[PDB]
């Protein structure tokens, strides 16, 4: 069993690594809800891009009470992405949950971008 690295963990661990996520003590068997329910609100990738490249949210919602205030995240978000030119995702199938797996895959890619290759020099 767990054979492949899929994403999702990768992702879990990813942002946590970074500071953008929380990370919980507990593992996590189901990530794929967690990572979903983590990213909807949006708050949570609209930092995460800021820390990848400096200045790539302008002002994001850090506790969205309301609907207008998590969307307006996600998208702040995508603003960011447009930058790595990387496969992005609508803001409603991360915050209604209709297709994850393109909301986790866009990820994965910036995730790839960021990593730094050559250091020599």
């Known amino acids: 069993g767990s054979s492949g690295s ?30 979903k329910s983590s990213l909807k609100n949006g708050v949570v990738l609209c930092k995460l891009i800021n820390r990848l ?10 506790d969205p009470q309301t609907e207008a205030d998590c969307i307006n995240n996600i998208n702040d978000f995508l603003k960011g992405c447009a930058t790595l030119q990387v496969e992005i995702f609508d803001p409603d199938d991360l915050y209604s949950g209709v297709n994850f797996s393109k ?17 020599s020099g």
């Open 6 to 35: 899929s994403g999702e963990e990768q992702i879990v661990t990813w942002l946590i690594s970074l500071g953008v996520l929380e990370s919980p003590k507990k593992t996590i068997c189901d990530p794929e809800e967690f990572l």
């Open 103 to 119: 909301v986790l895959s866009t990820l994965l890619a910036v995730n790839k971008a960021t990593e730094s290759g050559p250091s």
């Open 53 to 62: 490249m400096p200045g790539s949210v302008e002002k994001f919602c850090l």
